Structure formats: C-alpha cells, structure tokens
Amino acid sequence: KIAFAFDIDGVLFRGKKPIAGASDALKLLNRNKIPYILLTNGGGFSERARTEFISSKLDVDVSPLQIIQSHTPYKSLVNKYSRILAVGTPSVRGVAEGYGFQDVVHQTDIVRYNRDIAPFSGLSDEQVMEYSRDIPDLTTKKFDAVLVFNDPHDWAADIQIISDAINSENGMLNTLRNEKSGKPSIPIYFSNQDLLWANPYKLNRFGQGAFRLLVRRLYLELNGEPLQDYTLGKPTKLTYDFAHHVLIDWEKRLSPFHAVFMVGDNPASDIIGAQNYGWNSCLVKTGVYNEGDDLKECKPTLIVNDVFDAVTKTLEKYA
C-alpha cells in the first residue's frame, strides 16, 4: 500500500499549462487504484474552484476532497478570530467567508476607505471598485488577526497595511502603539514560506516566503525585535498533519499506507517537509530544483526528470 502527494507548481503545472506527463501520471494512479492528494503552497481560489480547473486541464476527476492549499488549514482558526484581515488576491475574501470566518476584511477594503493609507498602491480606480467592498465598521471594530492566504498583487499597499495592523493599538485601524515588542499587536499567519517557486518563466520567481521576509524586515526595523509570527504550509508539521488527515479521509471515501511519496520540485518545502514528517519523496527537475543544486541535507528517496518518471520509477521500485 502506497499513496502519493503531488505538489502542483513545477510538478503538474507551470502556471496554467500542464507539464507533459502530469495527466498520464494521475491517470496511471487512477487505473491502478492508488490514492493521491495534491499538496500545494499555492492558493487563492476555493478548493472546489481549483480542483475544477485542474480536472479540466489534466482530463481527470480531481475531487475538492483531494487538495490541500496554503490556506486550507486556516479552517482551524475560524473559532479563534472574529475579524480577520485576509491578505491575498481578491478571491481570498470568498475563500475565507466559505471557511466560516465571521467578519472578513480584504486589504483592498482599507485602500477603498482611505487611499492615503497606501500611497504606493498600484490599484486603478476600476480595480479598487472591483476588488474591494465597503466595510461600515472598518474603523470601529478591532481586527483579531492577519491571515495571509496567498501572495497579494500590490505589495507596497499590502505590506504597509499589514505593518499598520501588527503595530496598531490592539488591532484598531488608524492607530499606532507606543510599545516596541516582538509580539505583534494582533497575531499574523503566513501560509507559505517558499522563497522561490516555478511559474511559466525560465527563472525561479519569488513567492510568499519572500513576502514574509519583507514584512519581517520592516517589523524588525520598527520594533528592534524579530516578529513572532505563525507559519504554515510545507514544510511545516502542521501542514503535513493536515494533509495526512485529508489523505486518510480520502482513502476511507475510496473505500494505513506502507509509504507516502511526496512528489515535489523544491527541496526547501516539498522534500524537507516530507523527510521531517517521515514520508518518502521524489524530487523532479521541472521546477525550482536543477540537478547540481545544493541539496544541503535533504535526501530525496528518488531524483527524477518529471512527474511521470516520479510515479513510474516509484511504483517499479516500491509498489
């Protein structure tokens, strides 16, 4: 009994385009009745909307119950925080609402309220109108946490607005505390520490890990203490435990494994994540990693060209 956990970016897709072999890889598992999940540090859309897109592109039925995205574990926080600043692309508002967050504010809602809060926002008037909403108690009800769902697309605004929140007086908009501290005014969560990721471009691009480093750098500058943030996403144990539960529930719904193989392109997320958790791993060369790159101390079970190689070589050798 083996199962697979596939990364998406640099393994199944580059952007919206499938990698050759990705469709065949999943079709092969389905023929053989081998369970799989998708475990991605990407996000932005609902689990349903994302799996609908992947299903269409790869010509397989991927269930919303087979996927863990960066933000999926934020379901665990819905009873902890009444009002959240949900940072990400505009779609993350709906995702957070769907999880059951009581009071969701998107960062663009603050830009709508007062453009002078974010002097270097690139939002056009049309983008403000489309992306944001009027929040009538934006200034009178405190924020309880900042949750970064995915990489937002207006960083001078996004970073300013996050900084305002984590240096505020107890989460109240338009306030600035006097006290310097490593503990932010309200808690802040990052869902992906990937410095780099693989999109259609030939060179690795910065991801949410890079965004996090930037937020942290300015927090340190203002406070003289490092930020006490929360982190999820691969390689964190929290995300692997979450994925493990999704996989167990999926395996039951198909109806515990001798081995789980993480298939990834990034040593620093996928491979270390699996290795720390006790999962096996197959490092592909179609994304962040190029053969010759420093593996440091991760030790992938197999190193292979692409996802179809990962599945076929793993099955031949281990199933």
Query: Which residues of the chain form contacts with its own copies (CB under 8 A)?
Result: 15, 114, 116-124, 126-127, 151-156, 159-160, 163-164, 174, 176, 195, 199-203, 205-206, 210-211, 213-214, 217-218, 221
Residues 138 and 161 sit within 8 Å (Cβ to Cβ): no
Q: How far is the CB of 158 from its own copies (least distance, A)?
A: 8
- What Cα–Cα distance (Å) separates residue 195 from each residue in 172, 219, 235, 259? 31, 18, 12, 28
Q: Which of 1, 77, 11 is nearest to 305 (CA)?
A: 11
Using CA atoms in the order 36, 40, 45, 50, what is the torsion angle rounded to 10 degrees? -30
Name the residue type at position 237.
K
Residues 2 and 289 sit within 8 Å (Cβ to Cβ): no
List CB contacts of 159: < 8 A, sequence separation 6 or more.
Answer: 211, 214, 215, 218
Among the residue ranges 122-130, 136-144, 213-221, 250-258, the one whose residues contact Mg ion (CB under 5 A)? 122-130
Q: Which of its own copies, Mg ion, none does residue 179 bind (CB under 5 to 8 Å by kind)?
A: none
Build a one-symbol-per-residue string for 249-268: x at contacts with Mg ion by CB under 5 A, - elsewhere. ----------------xx--
Q: Does 42 bind Mg ion (CB under 5 A)?
A: no
Alpha helices in 81-225 (DSSP H): 92-99, 107-113, 125-131, 155-166, 208-223
Long-range contacts of 168-176 (CB under 8 A, 24+ apart): 168/143, 170/142, 171/83, 171/142, 171/143, 171/144, 172/139, 172/142, 172/143, 173/110, 173/138, 173/139, 173/143, 174/139
* Total residues at interface with Mg ion (CB under 5 A): 7
Q: Does 15 bind Mg ion (CB under 5 A)?
A: no
Q: Which of Mg ion, its own copies, none does residue 47 bind (CB under 5 to 8 Å by kind)?
A: none
Q: How far is the CB of 234 from Mg ion (least distance, A)?
A: 9
What's the CA gap between 314 and 273, in Å, rounded? 18
| Residue closer to its own copies (CB basis): 156 or 319 | 156
| Residue closer to Mg ion (CB basis): 122 or 200 | 122
Q: Which of Mg ion, its own copies, none does residue 60 bind (CB under 5 to 8 Å by kind)?
A: none
| Residue closer to its own copies (CB basis): 206 or 257 | 206
**Phi-psi sector, 76: left (phi>0), alpha (psi -120 to 50), beta:** alpha
| Residue closer to its own copies (CB basis): 203 or 254 | 203
Q: Which of its own copies, Mg ion, none does residue 201 bind (CB under 5 to 8 Å by kind)?
A: its own copies
Q: Which of its own copies, Mg ion, none does residue 7 bind (CB under 5 to 8 Å by kind)?
A: Mg ion
- Report residue 231: phi and psi, to 5°: -130, 130
Q: Does 229 bind Mg ion (CB under 5 A)?
A: no
| Residue closer to its own copies (CB basis): 66 or 167 | 167
Among 6, 7, 110, 188, binds Mg ion (CB under 5 A): 7
| Residue closer to Mg ion (CB basis): 110 or 188 | 110
- Tokens found for residue 86: 């949900």
| Residue closer to its own copies (CB basis): 120 or 318 | 120
Residues interacting with Mg ion, by CB under 5 A?
A: 7, 9-10, 122, 265-266, 287
